[PDB]
């Protein structure tokens, strides 16, 4: 379910999905599904989310466990795997951020 245009603190979200470019419509998007019970399925941005997670993991590497270490290594080269200098689809209008 690729989202084109749709426009939440960490307290009110408890689930998040990430998909590859091939699985999506050539994009890298995430759906921050809040805790049926799924109140919202807002289409977030995969690039910003993965970058924030990578930065958090790198800053917390002082006390990172083994599972989190391999998670960080997996998110690495997955950011680079996308390598999205540009991507076409979901053309619409916008005003500001």
């Amino acid at each position: 379910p690729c989202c084109h245009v749709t426009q939440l603190a960490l307290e009110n979200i408890s689930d998040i999905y990430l998909v590859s470019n091939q699985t999506c419509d050539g994009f890298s998007l995430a759906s921050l599904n809040s805790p049926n019970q799924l109140v919202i399925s807002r289409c977030a941005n995969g690039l910003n989310v993965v970058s924030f997670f990578i930065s958090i993991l790198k800053r917390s590497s002082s006390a990172l466990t083994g599972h989190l270490r391999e998670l960080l290594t997996t998110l690495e080269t997955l950011y680079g795997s996308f390598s999205v200098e540009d991507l076409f689809g979901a053309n619409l209008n916008r005003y500001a951020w």
Partner: protein
């Protein structure tokens, strides 16, 4: 008064590479620059426009930025499907006024 002059290009620019064409002449004072591309036998399309301090935004990925005296435009793709004559235009904001020819054959 203000005129725009581009450098003629005859090389096919191979197939996969970037291009950079300079449009500049005399010294602009209060006129921005706009880019127009037209395939042979088609309506020109507006590319990114540079006001010598900022670049406009078009869905095509054609990054074109100017300098203190000259202007440059990059496409990062020279496929034969993009073998079109590019145009640089002189305009304050709205009224494109002056343009000069070019040649961007791609093969």
């Amino acid at each position: 008064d203000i005129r725009l002059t581009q450098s003629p290009s005859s090389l096919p620019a191979s197939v996969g590479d970037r291009v950079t064409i300079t449009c500049r002449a005399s010294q602009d004072i209060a006129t921005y620059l706009a880019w127009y591309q037209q395939k042979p036998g088609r309506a020109p399309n507006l590319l990114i426009y540079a006001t010598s301090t900022l670049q406009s935004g078009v869905p095509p990925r054609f990054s074109g930025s100017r300098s203190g005296t000259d202007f440059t435009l990059t496409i990062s793709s020279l496929q034969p499907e993009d073998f079109a004559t590019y145009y640089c235009q002189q305009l304050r904001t709205y009224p494109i006024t002056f343009g000069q020819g070019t040649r961007l054959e791609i093969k």
